[PDB]
Design an enzyme around this catalytic site. Structure first.
Site, short mmCIF file in Angstrom:
data_model
loop_
_atom_site.label_atom_id
_atom_site.label_comp_id
_atom_site.label_asym_id
_atom_site.label_seq_id
_atom_site.Cartn_x
_atom_site.Cartn_y
_atom_site.Cartn_z
N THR B 14 0.70 -1.22 0.39
CA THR B 14 -0.08 0.13 -0.31
C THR B 14 0.74 1.49 0.30
O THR B 14 0.87 2.74 -1.14
CB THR B 14 -0.52 -0.01 1.68
OG1 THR B 14 -1.55 -1.05 1.14
CG2 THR B 14 -2.50 1.43 0.96
N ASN B 41 -5.05 -11.31 2.82
CA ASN B 41 -5.38 -11.41 4.87
C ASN B 41 -6.26 -11.69 5.12
O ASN B 41 -6.52 -12.92 5.00
CB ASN B 41 -4.22 -11.12 5.85
CG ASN B 41 -3.22 -9.65 5.54
OD1 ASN B 41 -3.56 -8.92 4.23
ND2 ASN B 41 -2.06 -9.91 5.62
N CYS B 42 -7.73 -10.69 5.08
CA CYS B 42 -8.61 -10.81 5.64
C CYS B 42 -9.71 -11.84 5.07
O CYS B 42 -10.35 -12.34 5.31
CB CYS B 42 -9.29 -9.60 5.86
SG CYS B 42 -8.43 -8.77 6.86
N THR B 266 10.49 6.28 12.92
CA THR B 266 11.60 5.45 14.23
C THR B 266 12.39 6.80 15.14
O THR B 266 12.43 7.91 14.60
CB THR B 266 11.82 4.19 13.94
OG1 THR B 266 13.37 4.90 12.80
CG2 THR B 266 11.57 3.50 12.91
N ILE B 271 14.26 6.34 8.98
CA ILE B 271 13.37 5.04 8.38
C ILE B 271 11.88 5.19 9.32
O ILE B 271 11.91 5.56 10.25
CB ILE B 271 14.31 4.31 9.78
CG1 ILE B 271 15.87 4.00 9.41
CG2 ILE B 271 13.17 2.72 9.43
CD1 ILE B 271 16.24 2.99 9.70
N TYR B 272 10.72 4.16 9.06
CA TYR B 272 9.29 5.32 9.30
C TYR B 272 9.13 2.99 9.62
O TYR B 272 9.94 2.46 8.51
CB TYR B 272 9.04 4.96 7.54
CG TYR B 272 9.16 6.75 7.89
CD1 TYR B 272 9.94 7.00 6.57
CD2 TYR B 272 8.19 7.80 8.10
CE1 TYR B 272 10.31 8.40 5.92
CE2 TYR B 272 8.77 8.98 7.58
CZ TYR B 272 9.34 9.40 6.57
OH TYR B 272 9.69 10.34 6.22
#
Ligand code: CAJ
Ligand code: CAJ
Ligand code: FAD
Ligand code: FAD
Ligand code: CL
Ligand code: MG
Ligand code: MG
Lengths: 436, 436
Positions: B14, B41-42, B266, B271-272
């Protein structure tokens, strides 16, 4: 205080009942011009359709029961014919005796609602639907004449529910409307599924069509077409019951409605007005508004109860115009300013069509969501939703958003309850905010 | 900037997709350890149950389509095994050749999610469900072994859907759970219909029950029961996929999750972290939250995209914890703080139970709506709804109300869309505000 109430249904009976909750001492009296109090107006087409067959669902109270439970006196068949505001009385015609008399009040609450329009033909087979006497008469006419073909005139929500229920009862209705602007609370291009629901079931309709003449069962139309029907049900709008108010000092607008402040007070001290008769303003924009629907009668009933016997700091904040109609498999729902009221703002449109829930999940159906918003402050002006599933949910959410002056952009932050049967990880509502 | 994304599903694919919409020139690459990207997944419990039947429905993309459609390179079977945050590379194991290499980045997005806990038995009949690989294997095992009795361990929402799907597929599940806290996002007393749905169906279940030992198909339980099962599906919680992260400078909370700020950053520049691995705070109260659900994966994704390639003033405002599960005929929805977090407030509880819509309208069922509010400020802390009908709607609106800080007393002002199929003129929601 002695409280007199005109009209014993949605606004009136509810408001009397709320007052009694707070104040157990005041004498409360309700005048109702017709036969029944607290009939279920919205249930009426379902009664015709024979979906609702138990009378206890059609009629919530009788005068005797209302008196026994609540100690409210209700006088049916009593028509209020003038308001003598200077003297603080109402002139009341007892329709059983044709005797008129004055009733005095400390507070007067006007909830007379609206009456259906008639087309004006001299006809034994033509009916309008507004109360339970109407409903009983249509039920009886149908049985007595073994009605098969019915002509349904008009295209608002009342006509639609009646059409559907006639069809479900097993009659053969035809729908006519004088123009192509059917169901006009809804965006005009979002109404097409009404027509497709008619075609799929081979229920005939003609738009831009009107009854031109009636001769027993022979009906002649303005298209020139001539046809035989056993019955006609006319849903061609309503007019306010305010003729009896005109001689009083109560300000009426030129359409015969009653402007009120956020306390539901009229220009005249001690006189309140609520329900379809009353106009106010929108909550989210600075425009007048009239919303002749059930929530509004109930909410005003509660506020006026407070004003009189409870907390008078409780005030109305204005209408959102939330409305909704079911027609066969589809739901049509909107909130905000009416389509024609849109021209008053600088606005923009965003829209989305998607499964109401997960595509793989069984029994999906596209749902069309449209939102208009003010270009100068990004505020939501209006939303509309159509689909077999989940239109009501989306419009209820947008109603709460508008309530809180939300921007279209902030719709990306709405945290949806997600699982496959219910929606999408990014819901149509979130999609509205992204697409903006 | 060059963007590396770790994990190619709800957060990862996404987020990558969202960046590409804003930004055409950057090189984006996603490493996924397992076989498939962007699987649903769902959908997976419904694939087991054959309610979904074509895997096209369970797989939104393949690396080749993603590259042709969005020019994003996806490498499956490529496991990131370390972050070398000072040099800005990641170390990546090619699982097919067993050879590693380094990948440089200007921006690193971590969305590795969670893996299923196991009970740790050595057993050929035991499976966990977490991706399409797991689904194919379970499906294949059922067919290959003529699976009839299935032991379903755990009672979180996933295990519940799986149990229902096994049932609807024609198998005979038994449910056990180590405690009686079934479906823990819901108020415990409101979870009773789960147990009635099972009873009505003669699906056996035992709570405060554990597996003691497995000998082939003979299962021994804590209670002393010894039963034969053809298959065991274990939903015993999840753990964060953060082992590859421990050697870097990223701060991990004691449970393995990554604390992030409202930009999903983070403690390490560039970095996320998004999706199930990330923890944040609630929107309506000052408390830490982690809400490992789809809406939050997709919402973080969009926020990270704007941070990197779009409008950088766009930030997270916090979670509300909106959640929902269908189980047989009922819906269980809730939003706000969790049951155990209530203890941190001075609170009161209000509740209504009424039909979802008009009593006279067919297919009505009782809907139970519970609202918690903070006594010091009247603000809604938590809401919960259970019924065959209407729960999703109420909880969505309440979530929209909480997003706006709204008090319990202002629910009286909620203008519902009213017609007999949908609600009441005074909705359950309105009733909460009057009863408060
Ligand atoms: C729940 C388990 C949790 N969910 C998941 O596991 C989800 C797995 N999801 C994914 O892998 C990615 O979500 C996808 C499936 C690859 C989609 O990524 P995306 O959201 O960027 O979608 P697109 O395919 O690029 O777009 C499709 C429609 O959305 C419009 N769109 C997206 N973003 C938009 C923005 N920012 N602005 C305007 N429009 C935007 C697209 O234009 C596209 O439009 P169209 O009208 O249909 O052509 C269980 C489950 O969740 O599994 C199932 C999800
Ligand atoms: C069309 C829309 C037409 N709308 C109509 O309303 C049709 C006619 N309606 C009426 O005449 C009146 O509205 C009633 C139903 C006869 C008056 O009811 P009410 O709202 O005053 O409430 P009660 O009849 O006294 O019923 C009591 C249950 O609700 C709780 N309640 C009411 N008000 C409360 C406040 N203010 N605070 C707390 N609780 C309150 C009561 O305690 C009472 O509860 P209980 O569980 O039974 O003990 C189509 C249509 O709508 O027609 C059908 C509506
Ligand atoms: C068939 C039908 C379906 C509907 N469906 C819906 C729906 O789905 N959703 C929705 O929100 N709304 C619906 N409505 C509208 C809703 O019922 C009205 O909005 C609501 O009843 C208005 O309340 P009121 O008290 O102002 O008017 P009413 O409830 O109509 O009551 C006015 C009463 O006052 C009496 N009266 C008038 N003048 C006098 C007088 N001079 N003296 C004594 N008594 C008098 C009248 O006899 C009438 O009984 C529907 C209406 C109808 C007719
Ligand atoms: C059966 C099931 C049903 C569900 N139903 C719902 C529901 O109804 N509603 C809902 O809101 N949520 C639901 N969820 C959870 C939802 O899927 C997650 O909240 C969401 O997928 C979280 O996204 P993520 O990117 O953090 O995790 P995931 O989508 O699981 O993606 C993580 C991916 O990263 C990969 N990965 C991990 N470590 C590495 C590494 N070192 N290198 C490379 N790749 C790696 C993993 O293999 C995995 O494929 C469900 C989950 C499951 C399993
Ligand atoms: Cl009958
Ligand atoms: Mg005079
Ligand atoms: Mg190092």
């Amino acid at each position: 205080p002695k409280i007199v109430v005109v009209g014993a249904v949605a606004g009136g009976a509810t408001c009397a009942s709320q007052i009694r909750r707070l104040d157990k001492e005041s004498d409360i009296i309700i005048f109702e011009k017709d036969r029944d109090m607290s009939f279920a107006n919205c249930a009426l087409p379902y009664v015709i359709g024979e979906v609702v067959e138990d009378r206890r669902y059609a009629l919530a109270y009788t005068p005797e029961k209302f008196y026994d439970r609540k100690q409210i006196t209700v006088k049916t068949y009593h028509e209020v014919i003038a308001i003598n505001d200077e003297r603080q009385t109402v002139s009341v015609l007892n329709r059983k005796t044709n005797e008129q008399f004055e009733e005095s009040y400390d507070k007067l609450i006007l909830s007379p609602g609206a009456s259906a329009n008639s087309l004006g033909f001299e006809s034994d087979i033509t009916f309008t639907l507004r109360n339970l006497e109407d409903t009983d008469a249509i039920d009886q006419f149908i049985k007595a004449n073994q009605v098969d073909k019915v002509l349904v005139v008009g295209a608002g929500y009342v006509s639609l529910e009646v059409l559907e229920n006639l069809y479900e009862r097993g009659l053969h209705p035809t729908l006519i409307h004088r123009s192509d602007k059917i169901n006009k609370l809804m965006d005009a291009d979002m109404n097409q599924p009404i027509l497709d629901e008619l075609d799929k079931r081979e229920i005939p309709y003609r738009l831009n069509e009107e009854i031109n003449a009636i001769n027993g069962n022979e009906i002649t139309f303005k298209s020139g077409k001539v046809e035989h029907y056993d019955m006609i049900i006319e849903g061609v709008g309503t007019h306010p019951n305010s003729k009896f108010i005109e001689s009083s000092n109560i300000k009426l607008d030129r359409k015969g409605f009653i402007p009120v402040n956020d306390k539901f007070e009229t220009n005249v001290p001690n006189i309140y007005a609520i329900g379809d008769i009353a106009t106010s303003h929108y909550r989210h924009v600075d425009l007048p508004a009239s919303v002749p629907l059930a929530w509004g009668a109930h909410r005003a009933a509660s506020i006026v109860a407070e004003q009189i016997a409870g907390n008078d700091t409780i005030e109305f904040k204005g209408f959102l115009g939330n409305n909704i109609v079911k027609f066969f498999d589809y739901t049509f729902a909107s909130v905000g300013v009416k389509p024609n009221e849109l021209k008053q703002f600088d606005y923009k449109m965003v829209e989305v069509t998607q499964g109401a829930h997960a595509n793989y999940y069984p029994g999906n159906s596209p749902l069309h969501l449209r939102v208009y918003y003010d270009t100068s402050n990004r505020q939501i002006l209006r939303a509309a939703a159509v689909g077999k599933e989940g239109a009501d949910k989306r419009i209820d959410v947008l109603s709460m958003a508008m309530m809180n002056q939300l921007t279209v952009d902030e719709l990306t932050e709405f945290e949806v309850a997600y699982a496959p049967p219910y929606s999408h990880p990014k819901d149509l509502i979130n999609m509205i905010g992204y697409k903006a």
